[PDB]
Structure formats: structure tokens, C-alpha cells
Amino acid sequence: FGVKDGKCPSGRVRRLGICVPDDDY
């Protein structure tokens, strides 16, 4: 691993500037 805290968990949808889970959370 290179970076634990980035932006998204790779393969997520972004909205308003930040991505969130739909089916998982």
C-alpha cells in the first residue's frame, strides 16, 4: 500500500466533492 487515507476506496461515485457508499452503507 502507498496511501491509506486518500479520497475514495477506488471505484466509487463522487457527489458535492466527496464520495460515499450506496450498497455497502
Side-chain angles (χ1 to χ4, degrees):
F1 290 90
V3 285
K4 284 180 180 180
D5 282 89
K7 209 180 181 179
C8 294
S10 300
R12 223 88 196 176
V13 66
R14 205 186 73 176
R15 286 181 179 185
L16 287 83
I18 46 92
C19 59
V20 283
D22 290 90
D23 290 270
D24 285 271
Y25 205 90

